[PDB]
Amino acid sequence: GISRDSWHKRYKTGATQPVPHKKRKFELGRPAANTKIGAHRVRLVRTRGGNEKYRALRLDSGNFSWASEQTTRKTRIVDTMYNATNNELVRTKTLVKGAIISVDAAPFRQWYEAHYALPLARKKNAKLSEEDNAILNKKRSHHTMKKYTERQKTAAVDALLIEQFNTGRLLARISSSPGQVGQANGYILEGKELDFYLRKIRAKKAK
Amino acid sequence: GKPKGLCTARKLKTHRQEQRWNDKRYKKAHIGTRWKSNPFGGASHAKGIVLEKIGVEAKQPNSAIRKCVRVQLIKNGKKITAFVPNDGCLNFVEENDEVLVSGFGRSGHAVGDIPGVRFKIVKVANTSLIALFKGKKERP
Amino acid sequence: SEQTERAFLKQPTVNLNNKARILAGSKKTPRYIREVGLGFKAPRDAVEGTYIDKKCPWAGNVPIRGMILTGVVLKNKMTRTIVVRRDYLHYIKKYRRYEKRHKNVPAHCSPAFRDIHPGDLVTIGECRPLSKTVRFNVLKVNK
Amino acid sequence: MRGPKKHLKRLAAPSHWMLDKLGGVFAVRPNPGPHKLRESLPLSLFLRNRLKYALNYTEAKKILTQRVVRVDGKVRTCHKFPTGFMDVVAIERTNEYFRMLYDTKGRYVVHRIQAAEADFKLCKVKSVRTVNKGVPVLTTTDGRTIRYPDPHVKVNDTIVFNISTQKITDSVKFEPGNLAYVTGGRNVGRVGIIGHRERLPGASDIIHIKDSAGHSFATRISNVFVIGKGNKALVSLPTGAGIRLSIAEERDKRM
RNA sequence: GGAAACCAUUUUUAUCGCAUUGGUUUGAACCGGGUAAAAGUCGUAACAAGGUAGCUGUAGGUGAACCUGCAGCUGGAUCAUCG
RNA sequence: GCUGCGGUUAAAAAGCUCGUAGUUGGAUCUAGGUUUACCUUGAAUAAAUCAGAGUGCUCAAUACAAGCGCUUGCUUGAAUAGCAUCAUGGAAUAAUGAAAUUAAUGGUUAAGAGGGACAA
RNA sequence: UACCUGAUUGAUUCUGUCAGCGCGAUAUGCUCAAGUAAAAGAUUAAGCCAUGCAUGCGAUUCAUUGAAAUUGCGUACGGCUCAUUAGAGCAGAUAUCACCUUAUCCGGGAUGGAUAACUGCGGAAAUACUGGAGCUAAUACAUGCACCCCAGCGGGGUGCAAUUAUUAGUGUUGACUCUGAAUAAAGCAGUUUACUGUCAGCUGACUCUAUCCGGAAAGGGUGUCUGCCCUUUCAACUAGAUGGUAGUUUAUUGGACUACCAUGGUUGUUACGGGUAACGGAGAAUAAGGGUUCGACUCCGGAGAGGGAGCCUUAGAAACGGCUACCACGUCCAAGGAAGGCAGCAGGCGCGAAAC
């Protein structure tokens, strides 16, 4: 069927090459996963050596990573925003490695407050809900407050990240290959790369 | 004179290969049409059927009529003339007869005073012509 | 400048966003040099530089192993890749004389070796299949 | 072929086994394991040719089923087991003990030994690394991996391995001044004292070795096995003491 | 929750049709070349200054060999001829 | 026909010249009292065949056997040689590179090679 | 044994071939006292095949020692042939810090329900075809039996492997994004012996089966450098073509494929095209030296199983003594259907000079 053979091409000089043999099993290819956004769907595929791969067809949750804070929380992929390879992929909502998508902010906000006992650019006129208070205003002994005080020492957050957290939809880049590892684990954009891709996205939506 | 430099191997080899084609033996053995032109197709022996018998005026200064037979090879259907050795052996060859034929000896060239005849009969009707001449056997 | 394409490029094995560095305000982006070895001393443009190239010996993910050849650069028209010419002599026993032969070895030319022109000698190290025809990386410019 | 191979033709079999040309179409293929195909011997070949213990291979398999033979102290019933170099073979019923050794020619010879000899064997250090849980290990050229070895043990060094105790007794170093065996090359079966080491960075390095007779020859590391310290050999060598006789010398010895 | 038939679609794609193209072989009225063949017809072209010296290139003509014009060569029938 | 052919008349010198690729290229650097190319020696180099020791399978092709004591045994032979890569040494031969606070500061000669100038 | 001899002339010396002369391969004539080794349908028709065989053997035994059946294992080895094939394939050296693995080695890791034989009911002309019904077994099927976070009283997590992101540097290699130590998640389906016969004296010791991780070994996929037939009545060739970036696929790298982009890449040091009565090598014949020719064939590597293509199972196949479809050609039919692949051994027809 689908083959990755080097023959069937033209030689470096432009000559036709002979076909050395009939198509071999060890040089096969498989149809693209072409994963989309929707209810979790992953298939097992038996591969060479008895190993097995996870081909994602539809993914909604991403076990995303925040690099600076060194945290890893399960958020939900919301929408595709920009793709360098082709824009048909962003139009069709394909989750491919290096694709730029939008994720929720609630899980990372919850972790941030539960770990730093401080607000994350919370709303300037809305009282924290009961679940938020259950982790923000909680009261425990000073021996337990000491660790939180130590963790507060290094807790400033960048303006661009704060604005994304304000909108509630964070920009992220997929770092995994859903057609190979079945998961859409990506990382949250921050800093120079975030600004570059935000400028690209703004330029396109202006275009 | 020929080149003699220490870095002229390409020129020497290419010139030798080019000039090998001007050699009768090399060209004859590597032309490519040898099989199509040679009635036996590169073999040493062949089988065929008799059509007619002829007498060929031997070349000067010899005076005689050599008794050959026109045969059709079974492998390819080509028409050839084959010589019937020994005395009074054409009698043992009748029209529409199966014969084994071989080369005359000079590798596709006529032999002796027989003009244009380069094959010779080695068996007729599955019998050895020498045996037929020597009386060791009879016509089947 | 370094980012001129559709995507954003970075070294995979550098955390551009570390809490300590970002808080201290450091703009010294660490750069990964893999110290090619085999007595090859990393060029200063490789050790300090700003270009990104996933195929560079010092700023990419291409180890150097196998065999190390020397040649004369023939053409530089592709993007970051050249054509090196190796010339040798072939001996024919029958004629006891030699003949001139040559082969072209297309090799990836890192932007570190910015001083590359048709004529300069170059050293090239074997690397894994890097394109349809590229399997060698420029390592040293003997000039 | 479509997969791995199970057979090994007589001609394609390594020459050091000395298998008679008109002696069948196949040669007993050594199975994968401690040693390599071209650097080992089948127990079936041992019992059929070296010791004449089996007139035929059916007899060899009959002897081998009786669980009378021990290799490394572990009773084996695989006539295709790769009994290779520095391998101990103890037939308890006959109380016979042998250790595999390389004849000067390079062939394997029936090296009879006593119980004290059979009680131990040597192993070269093929590598040293760190398995999970942070327990360092070493791997020998015969595949034996030993946990928690002495940190000073490094690549190409010899270690005495105790069959009875499965422990490393002594560690001989690969350094200038140690009796070293020579396993491969055209100097298979040659014993000599290590000398200078030509160090090639990206290729197998070269060693120089001089025997007791003074003759000097070099080789690659992979063929160099240390068999002792100073001049003493940690095991008994066959008749010849690791000396290559030239053909005239061999004839002279014959008459 | 698992699932068979079936439906749609994507891909690998045998196979069949025209169409183009490459290579090999081959019939053919008739029109020509070469060769061979003991004793066919016409002449005499060449070998002697071969009876117009021969030959090369070129052009024309004639039953045929060949003849003629122009320029060359000696492989000529002159190694030479008197200032 | 590289070793190793022939070209006046036997087959064979292009009508003649210019010219790119190719081939080939003058002499000259420690005589005395950095790169290459090349040569030497080693490393890595499946057998079977070829070359090559021994052995009365009755000889030999072959084969790789066998040969002594005496019974519960000892010794055996089944050898030896046969582009590219790497390294060591050699520095003739053939290419190739260097310079246009002190020191001799740094350019070989000018071919019975070649080019150009001048004279009449 | 570094060799020549006859033939152009009335005669001579040359040039030059023809012929003779030695070996070897294939075929064949005549003839052949008995014995020993011993090639043998390669050449053309990788043409077609009647008939027989060539792959079958621990757990589960209420049949009569072990039948039948279910599992497990193997059938990817071995054997045959040389059609295709001219940066294919092979040889030597060499990478795989770009990869995948059963068998064998070393280390670490006494739970329920259904199904056959068996009983019986049956269908079809015909298969190594099978549906129901009643059981009934399992190594089949299923189920598994010191640091981090909150709070230093106490609660949880941490096996291996693994996705992503991050931290420091317990070991190497020439060099590692390699291996170890950690940190945050989450699914992931993989694994940490409900196995057979047991024996010795509550204590022990086996044989066996199953089973993941790490390293070997063996095997394979790919990459690099050098060499390998003829042809110019083939001189220019190439458009996924050469490269860049982002992806997809794969075991992995890669224009392997996709999107965008650039105009590149080979060539008289012979590119490109064409031919081969071309599988490559180890080698064979001849043979002063230098060589010329060949090599289907017992070993190594490659390819194929009438021609193509696509797949299941698996550690391993694009398998064909496995399946699926098309084409060519057959076989049995009760005309509704069912089948086949000897370039395995032995034989048969054809083809042939040519092979049991």
Side-chain angles (χ1 to χ4, degrees):
Chain A
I2 313 194
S3 193
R4 295 165 11 253
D5 45 83
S6 223
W7 50 271
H8 97 269
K9 295 278 288 177
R10 286 190 173 275
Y11 189 73
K12 141 175 34 177
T13 74
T16 278
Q17 329 181 221
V19 177
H21 47 52
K22 296 171 162 145
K23 264 183 218 173
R24 293 253 167 290
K25 167 46 156 81
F26 58 67
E27 80 200 0
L28 82 87
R30 278 194 264 279
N34 253 326
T35 162
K36 295 262 172 23
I37 305 176
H40 194 259
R41 265 151 92 92
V42 182
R43 319 264 155 119
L44 283 201
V45 319
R46 157 68 164 58
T47 61
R48 186 149 257 259
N51 315 131
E52 77 76 357
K53 266 180 202 164
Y54 316 93
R55 179 127 302 138
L57 294 190
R58 307 209 265 251
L59 281 177
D60 231 343
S61 71
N63 196 109
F64 273 78
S65 147
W66 208 354
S68 79
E69 322 302 351
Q70 316 193 357
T71 182
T72 311
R73 300 292 118 193
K74 176 286 199 63
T75 162
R76 76 172 254 263
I77 297 178
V78 152
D79 184 3
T80 74
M81 219 63 192
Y82 181 92
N83 182 284
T85 297
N86 187 7
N87 72 29
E88 266 68 352
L89 309 165
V90 49
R91 199 169 69 174
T92 56
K93 321 223 189 308
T94 325
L95 309 180
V96 291
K97 200 253 200 55
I100 286 159
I101 60 64
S102 274
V103 297
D104 228 8
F108 286 118
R109 292 242 289 230
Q110 290 177 24
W111 170 95
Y112 165 108
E113 301 169 337
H115 207 270
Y116 282 46
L118 243 84
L120 186 27
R122 283 289 193 151
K123 182 68 105 202
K124 308 96 181 182
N125 43 273
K127 171 62 168 133
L128 280 309
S129 88
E130 67 286 351
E131 44 82 1
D132 316 289
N133 308 343
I135 50 83
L136 249 180
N137 325 102
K138 46 71 151 186
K139 142 63 187 61
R140 194 47 231 162
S141 214
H142 313 98
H143 197 347
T144 71
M145 162 37 162
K146 259 156 33 160
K147 42 208 190 200
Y148 291 66
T149 50
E150 205 42 276
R151 300 213 291 236
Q152 154 67 106
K153 268 264 181 133
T154 45
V157 168
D158 173 28
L160 270 38
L161 249 185
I162 283 306
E163 186 310 328
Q164 305 303 122
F165 269 102
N166 281 330
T167 278
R169 317 217 173 299
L170 279 207
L171 274 187
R173 156 180 207 271
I174 294 77
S175 80
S176 82
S177 278
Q180 307 288 321
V181 314
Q183 258 165 3
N185 310 352
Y187 73 78
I188 272 296
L189 259 54
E190 202 213 334
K192 211 48 144 304
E193 166 173 359
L194 174 278
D195 163 6
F196 165 85
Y197 276 136
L198 180 295
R199 172 177 254 91
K200 278 286 192 283
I201 272 183
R202 198 252 305 309
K204 286 198 140 172
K205 152 251 283 173
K207 292 154 52 71
Chain B
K2 69 187 75 177
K4 295 289 220 97
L6 184 74
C7 199
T8 74
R10 177 177 287 111
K11 177 122 188 135
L12 302 179
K13 146 170 263 171
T14 312
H15 187 66
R16 179 50 64 239
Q17 183 52 44
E18 166 179 329
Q19 294 310 304
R20 268 165 108 96
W21 287 112
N22 302 319
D23 179 349
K24 232 168 201 224
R25 312 193 280 310
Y26 183 89
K27 199 175 193 332
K28 165 152 205 309
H30 294 88
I31 183 47
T33 83
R34 34 195 189 282
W35 302 281
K36 184 222 190 163
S37 100
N38 167 17
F40 279 13
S44 26
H45 302 263
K47 269 170 200 179
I49 295 280
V50 188
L51 311 172
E52 78 187 28
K53 320 200 239 177
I54 320 89
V56 278
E57 176 169 62
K59 281 153 106 154
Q60 285 336 81
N62 272 2
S63 197
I65 216 76
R66 312 271 159 207
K67 48 176 31 56
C68 308
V69 311
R70 201 73 200 310
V71 172
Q72 147 158 271
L73 300 176
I74 275 159
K75 258 172 20 172
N76 34 38
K78 325 224 190 164
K79 307 318 187 82
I80 74 190
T81 286
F83 168 64
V84 202
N86 291 335
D87 179 35
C89 266
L90 194 83
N91 301 325
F92 269 131
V93 190
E94 288 109 26
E95 316 322 357
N96 279 84
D97 259 317
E98 166 287 306
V99 293
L100 185 70
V101 49
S102 100
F104 221 148
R106 270 161 71 59
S107 266
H109 191 278
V111 196
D113 52 21
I114 324 184
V117 167
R118 64 217 47 231
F119 303 98
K120 73 180 201 203
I121 283 305
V122 48
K123 293 161 131 156
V124 47
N126 205 151
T127 312
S128 323
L129 213 57
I130 73 93
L132 293 183
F133 183 71
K134 274 191 180 183
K136 302 233 183 190
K137 283 166 189 72
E138 205 230 348
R139 190 129 186 78
Chain C
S1 68
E2 54 260 75
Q3 312 298 343
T4 191
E5 292 229 317
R6 265 173 196 290
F8 187 88
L9 328 168
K10 33 198 208 63
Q11 286 84 321
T13 38
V14 54
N15 177 353
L16 203 160
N17 287 332
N18 204 349
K19 321 172 283 203
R21 273 199 297 282
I22 59 143
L23 290 168
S26 76
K27 316 198 213 107
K28 278 51 67 185
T29 88
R31 152 170 298 237
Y32 181 91
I33 309 314
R34 85 160 271 138
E35 170 250 356
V36 160
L38 302 152
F40 280 100
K41 272 26 169 180
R44 74 86 60 88
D45 286 59
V47 188
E48 79 77 356
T50 165
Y51 67 81
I52 299 69
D53 174 278
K54 34 173 224 206
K55 290 169 187 150
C56 217
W58 293 283
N61 193 42
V62 310
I64 297 304
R65 63 304 185 282
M67 81 174 27
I68 291 269
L69 318 156
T70 278
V72 163
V73 70
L74 168 61
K75 283 179 285 173
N76 83 312
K77 302 262 208 33
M78 276 105 85
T79 295
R80 268 83 74 80
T81 87
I82 52 172
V83 197
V84 198
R85 204 165 129 148
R86 305 159 48 60
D87 313 273
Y88 49 106
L89 298 178
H90 186 234
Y91 181 70
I92 315 200
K93 212 198 147 313
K94 194 179 139 167
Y95 297 104
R96 313 167 192 206
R97 292 163 173 74
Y98 300 73
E99 99 188 13
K100 276 178 194 183
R101 290 197 177 177
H102 89 271
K103 261 149 187 215
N104 285 4
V105 172
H108 179 262
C109 157
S110 158
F113 301 93
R114 137 169 290 211
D115 303 322
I116 198 97
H117 285 256
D120 324 290
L121 291 288
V122 295
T123 325
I124 50 166
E126 196 197 326
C127 59
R128 54 131 188 292
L130 209 78
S131 76
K132 169 127 161 29
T133 65
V134 174
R135 291 100 163 82
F136 281 93
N137 232 318
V138 175
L139 292 180
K140 161 159 191 27
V141 164
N142 328 301
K143 175 50 192 144
Chain D
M1 22 202 85
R2 277 176 283 156
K5 19 198 172 153
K6 331 286 207 43
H7 304 47
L8 175 84
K9 326 299 277 281
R10 193 73 146 211
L11 291 190
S15 38
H16 294 110
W17 305 357
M18 336 210 303
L19 287 203
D20 81 88
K21 180 171 61 133
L22 293 199
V25 152
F26 295 89
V28 153
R29 166 166 197 106
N31 295 346
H35 301 286
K36 318 181 133 162
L37 211 166
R38 326 185 47 51
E39 313 59 7
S40 69
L41 181 79
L43 190 40
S44 196
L45 286 210
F46 206 20
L47 309 164
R48 285 280 280 95
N49 304 317
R50 305 301 202 248
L51 291 289
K52 309 265 223 167
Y53 282 176
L55 313 187
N56 58 33
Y57 294 90
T58 72
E59 261 153 49
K61 292 188 265 135
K62 289 157 163 314
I63 279 173
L64 281 147
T65 311
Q66 289 179 36
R67 309 191 46 103
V68 306
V69 177
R70 276 204 191 261
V71 179
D72 309 6
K74 337 318 199 63
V75 166
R76 323 293 197 156
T77 58
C78 200
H79 75 99
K80 320 177 46 162
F81 176 83
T83 82
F85 195 21
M86 38 291 291
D87 281 9
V88 175
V89 177
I91 296 75
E92 159 55 12
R93 218 193 273 190
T94 56
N95 188 33
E96 302 180 349
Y97 310 68
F98 312 152
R99 188 196 250 91
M100 286 337 163
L101 282 179
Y102 265 138
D103 161 37
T104 55
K105 306 293 180 58
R107 288 127 66 176
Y108 279 125
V109 288
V110 183
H111 183 52
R112 303 178 163 288
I113 58 182
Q114 296 322 71
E117 303 56 2
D119 282 355
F120 63 102
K121 83 177 263 157
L122 307 174
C123 320
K124 177 166 156 206
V125 162
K126 173 193 254 289
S127 186
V128 76
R129 60 196 330 144
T130 304
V131 283
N132 180 243
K133 251 68 196 159
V135 14
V137 300
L138 80 80
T139 295
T140 74
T141 60
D142 47 343
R144 307 193 147 277
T145 168
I146 307 95
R147 333 174 40 92
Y148 294 117
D150 165 28
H152 301 139
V153 181
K154 306 309 226 60
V155 195
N156 290 306
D157 330 358
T158 288
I159 51 138
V160 192
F161 189 85
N162 218 333
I163 311 184
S164 328
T165 90
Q166 189 247 327
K167 305 225 77 56
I168 295 155
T169 296
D170 196 292
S171 102
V172 171
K173 185 69 66 228
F174 188 92
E175 66 178 329
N178 307 92
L179 206 67
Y181 213 73
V182 183
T183 59
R186 46 193 322 278
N187 39 53
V188 57
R190 295 181 87 161
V191 183
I193 282 77
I194 292 170
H196 174 57
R197 188 156 150 184
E198 301 238 324
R199 93 160 38 227
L200 291 323
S204 196
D205 287 10
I206 316 291
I207 317 298
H208 318 81
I209 290 99
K210 337 167 63 164
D211 48 16
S212 77
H215 312 331
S216 268
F217 44 94
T219 206
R220 282 197 180 166
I221 309 199
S222 54
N223 283 335
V224 192
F225 175 50
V226 186
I227 59 164
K229 220 206 153 50
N231 160 269
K232 284 303 315 304
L234 305 178
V235 286
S236 46
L237 303 179
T239 67
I243 299 304
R244 205 129 299 192
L245 295 192
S246 308
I247 197 77
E249 310 183 345
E250 174 162 358
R251 181 211 36 209
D252 152 33
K253 195 71 54 74
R254 165 192 305 296
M255 81 300 201

